[PDB]
Design a protein around this ligand. Structure first.
Ligand SMILES: *[C@@H]1O[C@H](CO)[C@@H](O[C@@H]2O[C@H](CO)[C@@H](O)[C@H](O)[C@H]2NC(C)=O)[C@H](O)[C@H]1NC(C)=O
Ligand SMILES: *[C@@H]1O[C@H](CO)[C@@H](O[C@@H]2O[C@H](CO)[C@@H](O)[C@H](O)[C@H]2NC(C)=O)[C@H](O)[C@H]1NC(C)=O
Length: 343
């Protein structure tokens, strides 16, 4: 009946009110044409001011969408770039997550993974921990879908459920213990790029230092930082944060691992981002098959963020060359953390 579930797992105890719980749900594909009207409509806050139903201007990059009979030849494919307004995608404003801890309002938004004709939205809710004591369930409409959100009492008292076990990651590295009593586990993390200019937000200076990649003109590159939640329940992590062990494992994860096969690679493609650029500013790879990985990224070589939506293409997310690259808007992965299992 086009009804899907989203679970908010409220822990029994957390240390700080500045702590977000993450819910998400991957939804079935919709026609690409329908994305232009998609916007989450949530009953989850008492005041129905849904701050992220703001417009972000994207450059939508597309290719023919159909491969010829010459798979072996790797002629590139011409792209079309169009300016489009998308509402409700996970473009977090600077300080929005922090402000939620005081307003107690949750943030609702979606990622898109698309081939040339269909898009799978992944709906996220970022819930400030104090709202677990105010809410039991609510409803989000997105396109044809109705998502019933449920605030559940978690299985774990305080940690992260990892294979039926409750792992509690250490919060800090105040004391280094040479022969410790502890475990290491691989914990899921989600990171969102927050676009904001300033002299501390020159993330590509840190990309240059950490990965000895080839980036001249690091002064012309996108400015901002990633904000991440670990284990679906944590205080936010700001990435990069030098002299912070977990920020730096996520930083490595974002820039080294942004990702029978369900898709097939068709050929290279280059695009103008934004539509009016005098030459191509982004490299991509056209693919065919099931929508695979996020279609949302941010252009590397513009200090003011140029958001890119590239249905049916993989943007170049590899920063060896830096020119004509992009970064992920939403990155998901695993990082290893020390901690211990509850018992
Ligand atoms: C980013 O692209 C570079 C360039 O192809 C990749 O670096 C190559 O990696 C292979 C092994 O995977 C080496 O044999 C080459 O010598 C490398 N080329 C260089 C350093 O110029 C790199 O693997 C890509 N990054 C990711 C994460 O896949
Ligand atoms: C683009 O992606 C869509 C969505 O995955 C593909 O359409 C689905 O194809 C699967 C498997 O072939 C079918 O089981 C579904 O019925 C299709 N979904 C819909 C909504 O029709 C489609 O094949 C992809 N297009 C190309 C050219 O690969």
């Amino acid at each position: 009946r086009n009804v899907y579930d989203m679970k908010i797992e409220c822990p029994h105890t957390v240390s700080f009110g500045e702590n977000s719980v993450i819910g998400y749900v991957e939804l079935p594909p919709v026609p690409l044409a329908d994305t232009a009207q998609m916007v989450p409509e949530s009953s989850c806050n008492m005041d129905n001011h849904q701050s992220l139903n703001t417009i972000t201007k994207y450059t939508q990059v597309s290719w023919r969408g159909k491969a010829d009979q010459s798979q072996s030849s790797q002629n590139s494919f011409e792209t079309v770039s169009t300016e489009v307004d998308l509402k409700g995608t996970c473009v977090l404003k600077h300080k929005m997550v922090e402000e939620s801890y005081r307003s107690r309002k949750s943030v609702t938004c979606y990622d898109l993974s698309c081939n040339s004709t269909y898009c799978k939205p992944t709906l996220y809710m970022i819930v400030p921990i104090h709202a677990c004591n105010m809410m039991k369930s609510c409803l989000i409409a997105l396109g044809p879908y109705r998502v019933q959100v449920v605030y559940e009492r978690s299985y774990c008292m305080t940690g992260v459920l990892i294979e039926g076990k409750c792992f509690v990651p250490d919060q800090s590295v105040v004391s280094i213990i040479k022969h410790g009593i502890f475990d290491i586990a691989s914990v899921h993390i989600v990171c969102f790029f927050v676009a904001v200019k300033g002299n501390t937000y020159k993330i590509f200076e840190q990309v240059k230092k950490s990965f000895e990649s080839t980036c001249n003109d690091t002064e012309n590159k996108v400015q901002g930082y990633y904000i991440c939640i670990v284990g679906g329940n944590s205080a936010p992590i700001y990435v990069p944060t030098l002299d912070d062990f977990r920020s730096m494992e996520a930083f490595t994860g974002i820039f080294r691992s942004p990702h029978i096969a369900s898709y097939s690679i068709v050929g290279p493609a280059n695009a103008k981002v934004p539509h009016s650029a005098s030459s191509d500013t982004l490299s991509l790879i056209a693919y065919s098959g099931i929508p695979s990985y996020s279609s949302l990224s941010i252009l590397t070589s513009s200090t003011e963020a140029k958001h890119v939506f590239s249905p049916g293409l993989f943007p170049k997310l590899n920063h060896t060359n830096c020119d004509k690259s992009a970064i992920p808007l939403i990155w998901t992965g695993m990082i290893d953390l020390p901690g211990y299992y509850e018992f």
